[PDB]
Design an enzyme around this catalytic site. Structure first.
Site, PDB file in Angstrom:
ATOM      1  N   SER A 215      14.093  15.731   8.993  1.00 24.78           N
ATOM      2  CA  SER A 215      13.137  14.615   9.309  1.00 24.78           C
ATOM      3  C   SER A 215      12.168  14.587   8.287  1.00 24.78           C
ATOM      4  O   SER A 215      12.463  14.434   7.060  1.00 24.78           O
ATOM      5  CB  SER A 215      12.760  14.615  11.034  1.00 24.78           C
ATOM      6  N   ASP A 281      22.439   8.654  14.489  1.00 33.05           N
ATOM      7  CA  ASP A 281      20.825   8.637  14.172  1.00 33.05           C
ATOM      8  C   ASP A 281      20.157   7.712  13.348  1.00 33.05           C
ATOM      9  O   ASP A 281      20.891   7.725  12.102  1.00 33.05           O
ATOM     10  CB  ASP A 281      20.582  10.166  13.754  1.00 33.05           C
ATOM     11  N   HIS A 318      18.509  12.051  17.180  1.00 29.31           N
ATOM     12  CA  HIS A 318      17.773  12.671  15.907  1.00 29.31           C
ATOM     13  C   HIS A 318      17.362  14.295  15.975  1.00 29.31           C
ATOM     14  O   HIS A 318      17.346  14.793  15.060  1.00 29.31           O
ATOM     15  CB  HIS A 318      16.389  11.876  15.832  1.00 29.31           C
TER      16      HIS A 318
END
Lengths: 398, 402
Positions: A215, A281, A318
């Protein structure tokens, strides 16, 4: 012995050609290995804004991997953490990126990752002395990845003066707080200095640099890798002729910069990036215009796992342990490919910070937490919040 | 400790003279004595598994072995020298709130819960407390609706005998105390008789020593403690089997007690010479008013008012006024309930304990809210690399050899 013999291909020497569809079984374990070193950043990052140490590391450097569950049944995670990394930001960023005590140990800085290196046994097992930089990622809105581009000349130099980078990644990488013992030097230069110390120490051995992140951490890992290679920080100071390979294993990566960033990246011989991307995602789409991807992509689809709650949501598609479960069992992303765990990876790890598994798996959701949230009885009968191990972060003797 | 203050005064501290002269103002030894037994009730909350995602929801987390050390009652607790000898399980023939019987979503039992324990001082504790103290600790309410406490009255002849056939008890307390499940290894005998049997074993073991029974509980536990104390004394279960002429005193320290029975229950209670109950009551807590119609209170009352604490978040709510660690904080610092009495901690009781299961302290105290939880909710890495929910220590609960 298999990882040591093949490590250059596993670290992307031939851009993982032939190794992704279908997924090479050594590479399956290799990706999970480095993804675990990024998840360790989540497992030490204090997210309790009621604590004075919110945004710091829970665990000290000493025996760090044993403290976050990466020693038992992890014979290849033989690394010593040598340095913690801290970051700040001159501009306002989401609390998912920099989080603070509701008051504190710091008003503007967070623990942002670590640098580690294989010990002698890990060096034998992995085939080379592996220096790992692990960038901490996002904590629990796709609008958080909201940023215009900024010129990155202070990173890549006048010779690359057209390169632009996401303003948020740039600010977290580059900002300093002159009043802070943690970020008076920015996160970038903390990493460059420590990687330089390790490269010089091991200048006579075969060495690799592997950079890990999910991320936000994936963006920082991508930026960090490109900076290191473009500016020659993958050479020991006293051996400017010895370049070592820099490989980033990144997960659920947002985009980092523009087409000139991609052009710079494409001309660097010694860099490789594998972006593992979970098809449902959406964060790898952001920001949705103006940006380019770099590196090689490895797609997975966790909707194919019969262990995962259906339908998923932004968080469950995610989450990094969801990704690593997807790597552990992926047999492809075509509709006919049938998911099957081909490594012994406990499905319960998925639920560290999400309600991600089906209820029938019998694993509590969002289970990661210190005992008593860190409250601890002291020898005099008092009860104190002990959610932070002291570590001055002084350079280790080497 | 050196002067053995508690050993010398224990009969008065356990209410021999109905705590006369010891409540307003609060006697300093009694301050510590009340907290001592309130901690033994709170230990029941601290071992009770409330995670309904677990197969062991409703069971005890910890085993009997080294129990008090496992719930934080060894360090700086020189007087908590007790061995837990038996766990107690309860069921209900009628539906009751989840705050009373809590079950796994899926499980270890479909109808029973862990409901408390029986313990006894070891030879060191017996010296420190002045007698062999048998403790029955009834587990209380888990996290809110005051209607959870609103049940009607039922005739209690099965407990108190046809000689007391006018006594009525709250239907909920009666059902939890008395119900059995024939198919369960845990509640084939009801909670009442599990307690009576084990207290009987201990009274017989220690028949030649000075003995006391102290019964502890909060909320639901306070009602069960009151009911079991009255049952025990009224039916002569405070005598060893082989010495029917040796009564021992039965004292209940209860906290945030709902009402338990009707006027005939109170009349029965008033005629028992060997029973004493001290009901600690937090004035802003409305639970001790329930049920409001048809019931009587029994025993002596000790009022406190945690609104007077400068440590507690203001305004409070149902949960913070009711919570047991809030009560024990109130006991630790009460200087009276008059407007002019100023709260002051007179024992070294960590204020952070208030926040085990509530957001009860002012934010300035810098203690996280609702902090009690196992590490990783009990998920644990095993030696083969698997990760399993290990939130229950195995204990078959077989009688200990004594």
């Amino acid at each position: 012995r298999e990882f040591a013999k093949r490590w250059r291909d596993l670290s992307g020497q031939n851009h993982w050609k032939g190794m992704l569809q279908p997924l090479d079984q050594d590479l399956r374990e290799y990706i999970i290995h480095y993804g675990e070193m990024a998840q360790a950043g989540y497992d030490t990052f204090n997210i309790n804004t009621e604590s004075q140490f919110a945004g710091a590391s829970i665990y000290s450097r000493k025996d760090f991997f044993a403290k976050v569950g990466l020693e038992i049944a992890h014979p290849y995670t033989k690394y010593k953490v040598t340095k913690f990394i801290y970051a700040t930001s001159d501009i306002h960023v989401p609390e998912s990126f920099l989080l603070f005590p509701i008051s504190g140990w710091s008003k503007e800085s967070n623990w942002m990752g670590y640098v580690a290196v294989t010990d002698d046994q890990g060096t034998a097992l992995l085939g080379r002395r592996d220096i790992v930089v692990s960038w901490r990622g996002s904590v629990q809105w796709v609008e958080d990845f909201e940023f215009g581009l900024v010129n990155a000349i202070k990173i890549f130099g006048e010779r690359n003066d057209q390169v632009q980078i996401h303003q948020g990644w740039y600010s977290i990488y580059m900002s300093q707080d002159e009043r802070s013992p943690f970020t008076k030097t920015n996160a970038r230069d903390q990493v460059l200095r420590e990687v330089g110390r390790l490269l010089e120490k091991y200048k006579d051995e075969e060495v690799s640099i592997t950079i890990c992140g999910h991320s936000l951490g994936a963006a920082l890992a991508t930026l960090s890798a490109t900076d290191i290679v473009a500016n020659g920080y993958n050479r020991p100071k006293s051996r400017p002729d010895k370049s070592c390979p820099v490989t980033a294993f990144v997960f659920a990566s947002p985009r980092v910069g523009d087409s000139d960033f991609r052009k710079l990246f494409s001309g660097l011989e010694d860099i490789r990036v594998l972006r593992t991307r979970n098809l449902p995602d959406v964060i790898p789409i952001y920001p949705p215009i103006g940006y380019s991807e770099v590196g090689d992509e490895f797609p997975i689809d966790t909707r194919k796992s019969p262990y995962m709650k259906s339908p998923g949501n932004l968080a469950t598609f995610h989450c990094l342990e969801g990704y690593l479960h997807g790597v552990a069992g992926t047999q492809g992303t075509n509709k006919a490919d049938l998911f099957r765990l081909d490594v012994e990876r406990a499905i319960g790890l998925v639920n560290k910070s999400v309600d991600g598994l089906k209820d029938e798996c019998m694993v509590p959701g969002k289970w990661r937490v210190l005992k008593n949230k860190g409250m601890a009885q002291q020898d005099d009968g008092s009860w104190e919040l002990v959610d932070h191990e002291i570590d001055d972060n002084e350079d280790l003797d080497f």
